[PDB]
């Protein structure tokens, strides 16, 4: 399922509620087209991979999450598991989300 993180509070809780399944985060800006342009994919995987958890973050309204993750280029895909980080990669590459997810699945 998908989950929107509007505050660092929902961030950690998202990982804790994610259980043990993979967790890919999409640090995209709702006001920036190029980032939101990849939503028909990242958010789409929600129905193709109901076994994976997908999160969302607003680098502008949630600078608290981007601040701790020190994001400087959107979209930034960050992978977490059990509250721990395992990998990450930015740059518009929706096809990689598949290879990366099937990697640490």
């Amino acid at each position: 399922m998908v989950k929107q993180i509007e505050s660092k509070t929902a961030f950690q809780e998202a990982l804790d509620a994610a259980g043990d399944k993979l967790v890919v985060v999409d640090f995209s800006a709702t006001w920036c087209g190029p980032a939101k342009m990849i939503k028909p994919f990242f958010h789409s995987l929600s129905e193709k991979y109901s076994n994976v958890i997908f999160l969302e973050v607003d680098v502008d309204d949630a600078q608290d999450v981007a601040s701790e993750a020190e994001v400087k280029a959107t979209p930034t895909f960050q992978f977490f598991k059990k509250g721990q980080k395992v990998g990450e990669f930015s740059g518009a590459n929706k096809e990689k989300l598949e290879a990366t997810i099937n990697e640490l699945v």
Binding site: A29, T30, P34, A35, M37, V59, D60, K72, A73, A92
Partner: peptide, 13 residues
């Protein structure tokens, strides 16, 4: 307003 850094989505390639 809500602006931060550059969006290197399908902007770079």
């Amino acid at each position: 307003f809500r602006f931060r850094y550059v969006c290197e989505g399908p902007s770079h390639g």
